[PDB]
Amino acid sequence: KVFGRCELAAAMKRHGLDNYRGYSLGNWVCAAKFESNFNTQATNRNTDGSTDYGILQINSRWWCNDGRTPGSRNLCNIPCSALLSSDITASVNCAKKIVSDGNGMNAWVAWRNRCKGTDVQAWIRGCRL
Amino acid sequence: AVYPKKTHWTAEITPNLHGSEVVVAGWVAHLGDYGRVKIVKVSDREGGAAVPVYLERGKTPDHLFKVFAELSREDVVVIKGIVEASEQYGSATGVEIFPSEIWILNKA
């Protein structure tokens, strides 16, 4: 599914991401935009044998299990397939574990590269939350 | 061949060093592998700084990812890289190191 911006903001807010580990909701929306273009089915294989899955591009080495990445730790205890659905619950539960690992949202390269130090709250402007 | 000499204690790595090459030496306090970003935090004093050394696909030389993969918490390492002043999660310290070399002195 491809989410609308406000539609994803509302869904992230209902899932408790606004100010989760001190990150305001537009951080999460901006991260999804640059990680997946709001597309829940986004799947991207890396040269290292791992693949990133879903709206927040969660990686298969440590975080979810895709059954095909060596050294898989599955810290979110979830198959990567769960991260590809129309519903963001699994991606959110897993993003909360990742953002709590001790580096905040620096775990997402597209958040570092496109969101950090920018007007992140612009991402929720005009949304009726 | 032969690891380089420490130029700075981890506590001396401050935003005012932005753009400078440094060598830090100490133990692996924390490892995070998030796929395209991997972060090794290095400390050299108990109850001290844990300076994050950031590996990013597209930016860090590939060979350093192979070295990251050999790392374990408490390994003793020596890292050469460039200081970057930037906001860190849960710290007022505001620095990271983009590595050009990672040496593993020994495997705790």
Residue numbers in the entry:
A (entry chain A): 1 to 129
B (entry chain B): 0 to 107
Quote the original article.
In this study we have designed and tested the properties of a new protein scaffold based on the OB-fold of the aspartyl tRNA synthetase (AspRS) from the thermophile Pyrobaculum aerophilum. We term these small, single-domain engineered binding proteins OBodies. To demonstrate the amenability of this new scaffold to engineering for new binding specificity, we developed a series of OBodies with increasing affinity to a model target protein, hen egg-white lysozyme (HEL). Sharing a common range of epitopes centred on the HEL active site, these OBodies were also found to be efficient inhibitors of HEL activity.
For the second phase of affinity maturation, AM1L200 was used as the template for an EP-PCR library, selections from which produced variant AM2EP06 (KD = 250 nM), representing a 4-fold improvement in affinity over AM1L200. The crystal structure of AM2EP06 was solved in complex with HEL to a resolution of 1.86 Å. With three amino acid substitutions compared to the parent AM1L200 (T19S, M37K and K86E), it showed a binding face that was very similar to AM1L10 and NL8, with differences at the periphery. In a manner very similar to the AM1L10 structure, a small conformational change in R61 from HEL moved its guanidinyl group away from the interface. In contrast to the previous two HEL-complex structures, L4, with an entirely new sequence, was moderately well-defined as electron density in the structure. The loop showed some contact with HEL, increasing buried surface area by ∼100 Å2, although no additional hydrogen bonds or other polar contacts were noted. The L4 residues from AM2EP06 also made extensive contacts with the β-sheet binding face via S85 and Q87, potentially introducing conformational restraints to HEL-binding residues. Similarly, at the C-terminal end of L4 an intrachain hydrogen bond between S90 and T92 also restrained the loop. In this case the exact molecular determinants of the improvement in affinity were less clear, but the most likely explanation seemed to be a change in L4 dynamics through the K86E substitution. Although some role in long-range electrostatic attraction may be hypothesised, we think it most likely that this mutation increased the occupation of binding-favourable conformations of L4 by removing competing interactions with HEL.
